[PDB]
Design a protein around this ligand. Structure first.
Ligand SMILES: Cc1[nH]nc2[nH]c(=O)cc(-c3ccccc3)c12
Length: 289
C-alpha cells in the first residue's frame, strides 16, 4: 500500500476526474515488466483545499471493502514525498456510460438488472458507513467485466453526522442538476434518500442504453425548452419536478422497471424505497423468469 514513484510505469491516460487526471500504470518493483496494472489518480492543483479534499477521498476509499466498490490499493508520495497520488484498481471496460454505448452487442435486460442489483448492494454497504455518495450516474460507475460493475467517484462523498439524516452542502456550484433530488436542488440537502433518487436516474440511463437523444440532460432540456440558458434552466427543472414532471419510460423498458424508477422519484423523501428494498425487488425480478 506504499508504492514507489520510480516503479510506477505509465501505460495510458484514462478519464480526467475532478481532482485531476487518471492514468493506467504498471507497478513493477522487480523492474522487468511483470507487475500489477493499476489506476493512478493525480491532483492538478494541490492547494490547501484541493489536498484536504483529495485526502478525504483517500480515507473514504481506504475504509470501504465490497465487491461492487472500486478497490483502494495505496498511495504514492512522488516528487520526494512532496506530491501524492492515489493508487486504485484498474477496471478495463471504463465507465458504465461508455460501456453501454460501446458494447451493446453483449448487453441485454438481464445484464442491466445484474448491474442494477450490484449498484444497489454497493449503496447498501455505503449506508452502513453513513456515507452519502451525492454523484451516482453511469459516468461514475466502472465496469470490470460483462458480469461486474463497481461504484467509483468518491470525490463528492460525505459522512452524515452522528444523528443527522441529511447533509447540507454549503453551495453546490456546477452540479449535475439532472440527477439531483428536488430537495437537493431547492435546499442543498443530501441524504441516503437523495442517493435513491439519483439511483432512479441511473436505472433510467441503463434502460435508455445511453442512446442519442434520451440522456437525462437531453430529455429534461426537451421538456423545459431547449432554448433556455443559465439559471432559467434550474428554475424550470425545479418547477417541473415539483409538479410531477418526470423522465419518460425508455423504449422497450418493462412497466415493472419504470415503476421502480417512479418510486425512487418521489418528492416525498420518506416514501422513497431503501437500497435494501431495491436490491430485493430487482433480484426477485431476475429470479422469477
Ligand atoms: C479509477 C479507475 N479505475 N479504473 C478505471 N478505468 C477507467 O477506464 C477509468 C477510470 C477512471 C475513473 C475516474 C476518473 C477517470 C478515470 C478508472
Amino acid at each position: 500500500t506504499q508504492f514507489e514513484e520510480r516503479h510506477l510505469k505509465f501505460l495510458q491516460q484514462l478519464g480526467k476526474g475532478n481532482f485531476g487526471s487518471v492514468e493506467m500504470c504498471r507497478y513493477d518493483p522487480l523492474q522487468d515488466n511483470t507487475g500489477e496494472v493499476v489506476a493512478v489518480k493525480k491532483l492538478q492543483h494541490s492547494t490547501e483545499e484541493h489536498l484536504r479534499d483529495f485526502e478525504r477521498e483517500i480515507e473514504i476509499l481506504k475504509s470501504l471493502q465490497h465487491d461492487n466498490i472500486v478497490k483502494y490499493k495505496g498511495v504514492c508520495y512522488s516528487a520526494g514525498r512532496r506530491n501524492l497520488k492515489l493508487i486504485m484498481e484498474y477496471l478495463p471496460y471504463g465507465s458504465l456510460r461508455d460501456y453501454l454505448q460501446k458494447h451493446k452487442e453483449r448487453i441485454d435486460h438481464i445484464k442491466l438488472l445484474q448491474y442494477t442489483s450490484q449498484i444497489c448492494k454497493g449503496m447498501e454497504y455505503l449506508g452502513t458507513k453513513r456515507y452519502i455518495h451525492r454523484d451516482l450516474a453511469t459516468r461514475n460507475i466502472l465496469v470490470e467485466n460483462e458480469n461486474r460493475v463497481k461504484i467509483g467517484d468518491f470525490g463528492l462523498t460525505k459522512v452524515l453526522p452522528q444523528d443527522k439524516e441529511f447533509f447540507k452542502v454549503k453551495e453546490p456550484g456546477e452540479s449535475p442538476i439532472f440527477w439531483y433530488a428536488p430537495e437537493s436542488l431547492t435546499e442543498s440537502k443530501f441524504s441516503v434518500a437523495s442517493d435513491v433518487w439519483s439511483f432512479g436516474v441511473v436505472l433510467y440511463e441503463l434502460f435508455t442504453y445511453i442512446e442519442k437523444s434520451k440522456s437525462p440532460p437531453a430529455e429534461f432540456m426537451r421538456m423545459i425548452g431547449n432554448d433556455k440558458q443559465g439559471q432559467s434552466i434550474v428554475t424550470h427543472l425545479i418547477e417541473l419536478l415539483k409538479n410531477n414532471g418526470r423522465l419518460p419510460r425508455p423504449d422497450g423498458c418493462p412497466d415493472e422497471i419504470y415503476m421502480i424508477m417512479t418510486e425512487c422519484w418521489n418528492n416525498n423523501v420518506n416514501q422513497r424505497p431503501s437500497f435494501r428494498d431495491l436490491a430485493l425487488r430487482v433480484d426477485q425480478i431476475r429470479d422469477n423468469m
